[PDB]
């Protein structure tokens, strides 16, 4: 089998991407944030504290004839950005772009933190990291991809995120029309449960390429590119008027400035992030100070190749017995 679904930016900055997911019988369609940095499929629901729902579409398991309580099961997650949610668990039928999993754990939120409530466009998350990170207790549950894997034509999914435009998640096949050149594959460590890999270096604009190993994660659920402070400083030093602002919480720059591209290494291959992808707009309405899309990972404890980086590529998440990642230009 295969599946293919369009993913759409939630706002004009590409702060996140939402993908429609059918849950239950009859189908309830929720728009979920596909997150290769986590491993829980959780939804706003009829069980979510009423004061914590503000515009989201909810899953109502009592209206699904295929929903079954996973008795005794609870879940609770905290994300790198400080947000969190928790609740209980049902199993139900979940379809993405034509691909159906029966018996998928659907984690129903009883509580969500303020940032989730405040984002009316995201109805939940669909985790696509390794199932070892899944928070369901007492019995850890499998991701949608893990459940689908054996049925897929090939045990892969691909992320093709758009810049200020829709893109595509495919399951079970590689669309050879969706990228240019060849796909370069690189090794993955699953030891932390992430799609963790080592970039071979970077360049800033037309500058020479610096060969240096940068361990990080391919994370569709993180908006920006977070890299070591050395790398980030080298980038922003090429932007007139850029500075790191403690009060804002990262590098800002005047919008009158021209952003250089940023190149990252995948083996001997190179992915070029155009300068415009690094502009995240005014820090506040009407401000002339713009927020940067490349920021320091210092204090996160890991480097994160988030959407800013991934949307410059066609990315293969290869779930073969030994997982790997593939990157192509597009």
UniProtKB/Swiss-Prot annotation:
Which molecular function term from Gene Ontology is one that the record holds? aspartic-type endopeptidase activity
**Record family assignment:** Belongs to the peptidase A1 family.
- For this entry, the protein name equals Endothiapepsin
Residues annotated as domain Peptidase A1 = 17-328
Please name every pair of cysteines joined by a disulfide bond in this record.
255-290
Record carries keyword Protease: yes
Active site per UniProt: 35, 199
Which intervals of the chain form a coiled coil?
none
Q: Give EC number(s), comma-separated.
A: 3.4.23.22
| Keywords in alphabetical order | Aspartyl protease, Disulfide bond, Hydrolase, Protease, Signal, Zymogen
Catalysis: reaction(s) = Hydrolysis of proteins with specificity similar to that of pepsin A, prefers hydrophobic residues at P1 and P1', but does not cleave 14-Ala-|-Leu-15 in the B chain of insulin or Z-Glu-Tyr. Clots milk
What species is this protein from?
Answer: Cryphonectria parasitica (Chestnut blight fungus)
Q: Please state what class of enzyme this protein is.
A: hydrolase
GO BP terms, alphabetized: proteolysis
């Amino acid at each position: 089998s295969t599946g293919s679904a369009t993913t759409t930016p939630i706002d004009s900055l590409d702060d996140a991407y939402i993908t429609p997911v059918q849950i239950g019988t009859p189908a309830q369609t929720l728009n979920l944030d596909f997150d290769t940095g986590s491993s829980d499929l959780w939804v706003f629901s009829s069980e979510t504290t009423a004061s914590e729902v503000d515009g989201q579409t909810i899953y109502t398991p009592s209206k699904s004839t295929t929903a079954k309580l996973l008795s005794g099961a609870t879940w609770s997650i905290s994300y790198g950005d400080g947000s969190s949610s928790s609740g209980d668990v049902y199993t139900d039928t979940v379809s993405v772009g034509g691909l159906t999993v029966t018996g998928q754990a659907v984690e129903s939120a009883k509580k969500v933190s303020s940032s989730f409530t405040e984002d009316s466009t995201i109805d939940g998350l669909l985790g696509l990291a390794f199932s070892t990170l899944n928070t369901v207790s007492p019995t850890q549950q499998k991701t949608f991809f893990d459940n689908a894997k054996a049925s897929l034509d090939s045990p892969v999914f691909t992320a093709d995120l758009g810049y200020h435009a829709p893109g595509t998640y495919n399951f079970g096949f590689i669309d050879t029309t969706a990228y240019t050149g060849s796909i370069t594959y690189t090794a993955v460590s699953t030891k932390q449960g992430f799609w963790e890999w080592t970039s071979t270096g970077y360049a800033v604009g037309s500058g020479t390429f610096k060969s240096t190993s940068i361990d990080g994660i391919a994370d569709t659920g993180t908006t920006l590119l977070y890299l070591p402070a050395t790398v980030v400083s080298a980038y922003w030093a090429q932007v007139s008027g850029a500075k790191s602002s403690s009060s804002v919480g990262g590098y800002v720059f005047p919008c009158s400035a021209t952003l250089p591209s940023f190149t990252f290494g995948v083996g001997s291959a190179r992915i070029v992030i155009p300068g415009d992808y690094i502009d995240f707009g005014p820090i506040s309405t009407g401000s002339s100070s713009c927020f940067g899309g490349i920021q320091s990972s210092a204090g996160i404890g890991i480097n994160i190749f988030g959407d800013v980086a991934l949307k410059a590529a066609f990315v293969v998440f290869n779930g073969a017995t030994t997982p790997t990642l593939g990157f192509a230009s597009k």
